[PDB]
């Protein structure tokens, strides 16, 4: 029942591989639906063509800023921001998909894929999905990050949509 969404990842325009995510629509329906719709683009805007602007190896890969491409932009399907839905799910290890924000109830479109357990984020960031296939591709993406988060090559979502 939970939707599966895919990203095709490119590195300076070269196809790298595919990551798919299960979205926990059973537990965070409003948050999962925002990401699902942004991945299909069915509302007229979304993640296709956007970049991962911040990659910190051993911590996380951050993306979803499709309007300013640098961490200052993005927007949800529900308006500029929306509320923290709940904190049922925790940051239990690599592969967790969680919402970036700017304080309480400031979710937009930015997200991060954890590449480590990040328990200090529990109760502050809304967890809403997990990598299903292609964790090895995320690990490959990590090699283009750096300590301050700047990437050495342009990491883009070349295509994205729903699988199931």
Curated annotation (Swiss-Prot):
Catalytic activity: [protein]-peptidylproline (omega=180) = [protein]-peptidylproline (omega=0)
Phosphoserine found at: 76
Activity regulation info: Binds cyclosporin A (CsA). CsA mediates some of its effects via an inhibitory action on PPIase.
Gene3D superfamilies for this protein: Cyclophilin-like
Annotated CDD domains: cyclophilin_ABH_like
GO biological process: activation of protein kinase B activity; apoptotic process; cell adhesion molecule production; cellular response to oxidative stress; endothelial cell activation; leukocyte chemotaxis; lipid droplet organization; negative regulation of oxidative stress-induced intrinsic apoptotic signaling pathway
UniProt enzyme class: isomerase
Pfam families: Pro_isomerase
Reported modifications of this chain: Acetylation at Lys-124 markedly inhibits catalysis of cis to trans isomerization and stabilizes cis rather than trans forms of the HIV-1 capsid. PPIA acetylation also antagonizes the immunosuppressive effects of cyclosporine by inhibiting the sequential steps of cyclosporine binding and calcineurin inhibition. Acetylation at Lys-124 favors its interaction with TARDBP.
N-acetylvaline: modified positions: 1
Effect of residue 69 to A: No effect on peptidyl-prolyl cis-trans isomerase activity. Reduced interaction with BSG/CD147 and ability to induce leukocyte chemotaxis
Predominant localisation class: cytoplasm
Modified residues (Phosphothreonine): 92
Origin: domain of life: Eukaryota
Any one of the GO CC terms: vesicle
UniProt cross-link Glycyl lysine isopeptide (Lys-Gly) (interchain with G-Cter in ubiquitin), position: 27
Recorded consequence of changing residue 54 to A: Loss of peptidyl-prolyl cis-trans isomerase activity. No loss of its interaction with BSG/CD147 or its ability to induce leukocyte chemotaxis. No effect on its interaction with MAP3K5/ASK1
Localization per record: Cytoplasm; Secreted; Nucleus
Record's subunit section: Interacts with protein phosphatase PPP3CA/calcineurin A. Interacts with PRPF19 isoform 2 (via N-terminus). Interacts with isoform 2 of BSG/CD147. Interacts with FOXO1; the interaction promotes FOXO1 dephosphorylation, nuclear accumulation and transcriptional activity. Interacts with integrin ITGA2B:ITGB3; the interaction is ROS and peptidyl-prolyl cis-trans isomerase (PPIase) activity-dependent and is increased in the presence of thrombin. Interacts with MAP3K5. (Microbial infection) Interacts with HIV-1 capsid protein.
Protein name: Peptidyl-prolyl cis-trans isomerase A
Biological source species: Homo sapiens
């Amino acid at each position: 029942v939970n939707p599966t969404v895919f990203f095709d990842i490119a590195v300076d325009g070269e196809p790298l591989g595919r990551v798919s995510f299960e979205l926990f629509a059973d537990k965070v329906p409003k948050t999962a639906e925002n990401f699902r719709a942004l991945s299909t683009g069915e509302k007229g805007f979304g993640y296709k063509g956007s970049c991962f602007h911040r990659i910190i190896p051993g911590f996380m890969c951050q993306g979803g800023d499709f309007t300013r491409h640098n961490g200052t932009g993005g927007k949800s399907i529900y308006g500029e921001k929306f509320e923290d839905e709940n904190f049922i799910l925790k940051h239990t290890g690599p592969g967790i998909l969680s919402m970036a924000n700017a304080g309480p109830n400031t979710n937009g479109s930015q997200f991060f894929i954890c590449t480590a357990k990040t328990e200090w984020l529990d109760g502050k960031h809304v967890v809403f999905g997990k990598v299903k296939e292609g964790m090895n591709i995320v690990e490959a993406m990590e090699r283009f990050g750096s300590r301050n988060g700047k990437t050495s090559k342009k990491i883009t979502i070349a295509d994205c949509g729903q699988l199931e």
